[PDB]
Design a protein around this nucleic acid. Structure first.
Ligand SMILES: [Mg+2]
Lengths: 64, 129, 669
DNA sequence: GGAAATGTTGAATAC
DNA sequence: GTATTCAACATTTCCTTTTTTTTTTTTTT
């Protein structure tokens, strides 16, 4: 959950990060063992990816 | 002044500015006078009586023991014959006593002819007891 | 005399009055012991099918007979010639057996006896208390009743206790399969009818209920006392209210000819516990945990709830510093949040029983991660206090010393506790205090022969049967002390409470006229109650009398409030009173710690003011011992408020530590 | 494996 | 279609609410 400005909330207790494995051909949403209580920790990568993808999609619709 | 149940007029006033029109104090006074001229309660003798009712546990208990004269206790009458679980007993005793007290005060009035209870739950066939 | 108990003092029956009934003795003598299982399971039912029987009671085992109660002109008749049937006078029966017969017969004595030949109250009184609607697409209710019966007491000799057990009934249709057949354990069961006015549940061969719960092994419970708003209507739906109802019904059916009198325990010493003393004990208790490292671990498979963080937050809320870790640390205090024990298919899969055997010299404590949430999900603080105090107790066990102060027990005594691995020998563990160090060993078989020799007639409590009881043994004299639960429940003064609540109901049935309240306003200007009264009268209408529900803002605490309510009572409106006060003492036998040293009886209850709703009765415990007079130091062993959570205990504190020591030896050995 | 203390179901007994 | 005794797991409490307690609608697909 995210309001596109602040108050981001994730159902995962963990810090879901996003890693590209070139040995395979996959982008892996892997789980560091972070705890749900420390939601003010370092910003993971999955949230960044989703936010940027949303921004680009809405940008496409606005440009349309 | 709610945003759950209304548009945010703080935001609308920020965004529209004075394109958000508002009838003024003189206009509101004129509308108030017009509404008074069509609803002149005071010069004609209409009276509005207001009561605030709380729970009436003894009154409800006497009514329940009249409903089932040979049962043992009014808590048992509520549980068995009305079908109320042990969790809902206090809440039902609260909202039922007020409703019945208002109904009794309505009936004992000399010439009122039309009551309307407004509850939250419907009293349809799912609550027949 | 003292507090009231369910032990029966006297059962008085006019035996010549039972004119009203005919009693027969059905003797199944003659037939072989091998024939006994063949021809005794239906003997009760063959007697039932014979005619107009009220009820029957199985006699004393050595007598080997059934006593059967019938109407006066009725005659029993069985077709079996092997059975012996002789008329029996009422005086030949033991008094409690005759009382059990008459207690059973109450439902059909109160009614018109309904000349259909199969009247039956073979099972005793069942007073309906609660009902629950069945789940959807099913009819009928789940009936929760309270059963009244007499049973001879186990610990006491030649004495019987009146019992108030809960019994649940469910409709027979609930146990019928979809094809129309009933289940295995529902067929051939006795069937019960709910009375048309809804008081009693009684046996009827056409009945729709059987005596089983909705779900297997599920337990329903009726609360012991309920006085939540001094409501007589809620007092009546509790076990003590059902007991008062039964005492009324007994004299309605039989007059004064049948009476049951309960026993009062002689009141030597009864000390009470305040919440302040408990809090003073507890805040000083936890301080000994500071200088030991405490570790929280979460080894549940698929760690999902992060309950370890909740445990840490709760622990630091009591100003105890602790650290979360991925694995238990050898040498420190460890809490292992593990999964449920049965869901782990093998021992080595379970974190429990693995680090327990791995870290053989490490204090451990475990929990399930659902057991720290309330029903609304907030952290449960009581669980974390319990966990911390159990950790403290186990640390005291390992360190072989007391970390907090404990009352001095008797000197030169050894605490023995048998451990369940039944007339075969058990492992018996020992604890002993020398100087200031607690020793813990395992008793040798040479010792346990001397213990069993000195225990005399009481050796059966310790060296025979399932669940044997621990001992305190004095080796230099051969004296012992066994602490036995008699099963006797201790009752509050239910009759006086009932009278007071009835008077309050009668008083509160009326609305207070405005004239009386205005008079009290006029006459007592110095009372501080006057302003609230004037505000209430201003809010209220000017003519209609004030209902009692408006008075709820005015409590019964201040002397002015008490004077106001007493004046109202003098005017004829008994609206409020005090029943939880210690001056009246109605709710003694549910509070504090009672200890009669001369008789060896004791019990423990709650602390503080009596709660408005009490769910359990305190049992009476008896001290079997060989002293001429029990040593004074023995009663010091109960002066601890942390064995039980913030409450007095009924077992000596050396037995808790010894139990923990035995639990530690499960994995080291 | 929250604890103790109370309490009830089911099962075996079983006279 | 039995009665009585009894051993095994549930339940409530705990430095004291679990919290509030419902019916209702338009449109395209
Ligand atoms: Mg333990």
């Amino acid at each position: 959950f995210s309001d596109r400005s602040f108050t981001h909330v994730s159902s995962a207790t963990h810090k879901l990060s996003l890693k590209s494995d070139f040995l395979r051909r996959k982008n892996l949403i892997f789980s560091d063992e972070k705890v749900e209580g420390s939601l003010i920790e370092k910003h993971g990568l999955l949230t960044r990816f989703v936010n940027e993808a949303d921004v680009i999609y809405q940008w496409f619709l606005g440009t349309m | 002044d709610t945003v759950i149940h209304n548009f945010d007029f703080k935001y609308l006033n920020e965004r529209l500015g004075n394109k958000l029109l508002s009838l003024s104090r003189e206009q509101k006074q004129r509308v108030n006078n017009y509404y008074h001229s069509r609803r002149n309660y005071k010069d004609n003798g209409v009276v509005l009586t207001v009561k605030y009712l709380n729970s009436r546990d003894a009154f409800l208990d006497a009514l329940l023991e009249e409903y089932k004269p040979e049962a043992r206790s009014s808590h048992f009458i509520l549980n068995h014959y009305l079908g109320i679980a042990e969790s809902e007993q206090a809440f039902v005793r609260s909202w039922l006593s007020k409703l019945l007290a208002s109904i009794k005060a309505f009936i004992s009035s000399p010439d009122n002819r039309y009551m309307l209870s407004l509850l939250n739950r419907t009293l349809d066939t799912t609550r027949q007891n | 005399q003292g507090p009231l108990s369910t032990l029966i003092e006297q059962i008085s029956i006019d035996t010549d009055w039972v004119r009203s009934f005919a009693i027969y003795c059905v003797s199944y003598k003659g037939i072989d012991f091998s024939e006994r299982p063949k021809r005794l399971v239906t003997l009760a039912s063959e007697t039932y099918k014979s005619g107009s029987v009220y009820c029957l009671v199985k006699g004393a085992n050595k007598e080997a007979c059934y006593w059967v109660l019938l109407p006066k002109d009725s005659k029993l008749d069985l077709k079996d010639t092997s059975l012996a049937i002789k008329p029996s006078s009422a005086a030949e029966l033991p008094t409690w057996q005759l009382a059990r017969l008459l207690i059973k017969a109450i439902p059909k004595v109160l009614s018109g006896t309904m000349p259909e030949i199969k009247r039956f109250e073979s099972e005793g009184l069942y007073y309906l208390v609660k009902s629950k609607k069945l789940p959807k697409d099913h009819s009928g209710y789940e009936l929760t009743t309270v059963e009244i019966d007499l049973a001879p007491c186990a610990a006491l000799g030649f004495k019987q206790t009146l019992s108030m057990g809960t019994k649940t009934f469910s409709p027979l249709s609930w146990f019928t399969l979809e094809n129309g057949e009933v289940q295995k354990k529902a067929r051939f069961a006795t069937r019960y009818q709910l009375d048309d006015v809804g008081k009693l549940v009684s046996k009827s061969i056409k009945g729709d209920y059987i005596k089983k719960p909705l779900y297997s092994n599920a337990k329903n419970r009726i609360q012991a006392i309920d006085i939540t708003k001094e409501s007589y209507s809620g007092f009546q739906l509790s076990k003590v209210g059902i007991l008062e109802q039964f005492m009324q019904d007994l004299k309605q059916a039989y007059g004064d000819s049948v009476s049951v009198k309960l026993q009062r325990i002689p009141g030597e010493k009864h000390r009470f516990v305040s919440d302040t003393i408990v809090k003073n004990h507890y805040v000083g208790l936890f301080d000994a945990l500071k200088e030991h490292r405490l570790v929280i671990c979460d080894l549940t498979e698929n760690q999902d709830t992060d309950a370890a963080l909740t445990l840490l937050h709760g622990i630091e809320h009591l100003d105890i510093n602790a650290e979360i870790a991925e694995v238990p640390i050898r040498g420190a205090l460890n809490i292992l949040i593990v999964g449920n024990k049965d869901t782990y298919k093998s021992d080595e899969e379970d974190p429990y029983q693995v680090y327990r055997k791995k870290y053989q010299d490490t204090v451990f404590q475990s929990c399930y991660p659902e057991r720290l949430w309330n029903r609304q999900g907030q952290p449960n603080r009581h669980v974390v206090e319990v966990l911390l105090k159990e950790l403290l107790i186990k640390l005291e066990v390992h360190t072989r010393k007391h970390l907090i102060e404990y009352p001095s027990g008797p000197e030169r005594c050894v605490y023995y506790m048998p451990q369940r691995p039944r007339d075969e020998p058990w492992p018996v563990y020992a604890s002993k205090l020398v100087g200031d160090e607690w020793q813990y060993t395992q008793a040798t078989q040479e010792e346990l022969e001397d213990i069993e020799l000195d225990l005399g007639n009481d050796k059966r409590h310790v060296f025979h049967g399932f669940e044997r009881s621990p001992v305190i043994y004095w080796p230099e004299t051969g004296d012992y002390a066994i602490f036995i639960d008699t099963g006797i429940q201790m009752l509050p003064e239910f009759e006086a409470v009932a009278e007071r609540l009835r008077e309050l109901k009668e008083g509160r049935s009326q609305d207070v006229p405005i004239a009386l309240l205005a008079q009290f306003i006029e006459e007592n200007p110095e009372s501080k109650v006057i302003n609230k009264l004037r505000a209430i009268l201003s809010e209220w209408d000017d003519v209609a009398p004030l209902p009692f529900d408006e008075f709820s803002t005015i409590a019964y605490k201040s002397s002015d409030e008490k004077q106001f309510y007493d004046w109202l009572r003098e005017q004829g409106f008994f609206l409020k009173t005090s029943i939880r006060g210690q001056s009246e003492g109605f709710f003694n036998a549910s509070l504090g710690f009672f200890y009669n040293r001369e008789q060896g009886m004791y019990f423990a209850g709650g602390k503080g003011s009596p709660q408005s709703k009490i769910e359990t009765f305190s049992h009476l415990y008896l001290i079997k011992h060989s002293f001429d007079a029990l040593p004074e130091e023995v009663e010091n062993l109960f002066d601890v408020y942390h064995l039980r959570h913030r409450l007095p205990t009924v077992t000596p504190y050396p037995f808790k530590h010894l139990r923990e020591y035995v639990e530690m030896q499960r994995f080291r050995s």
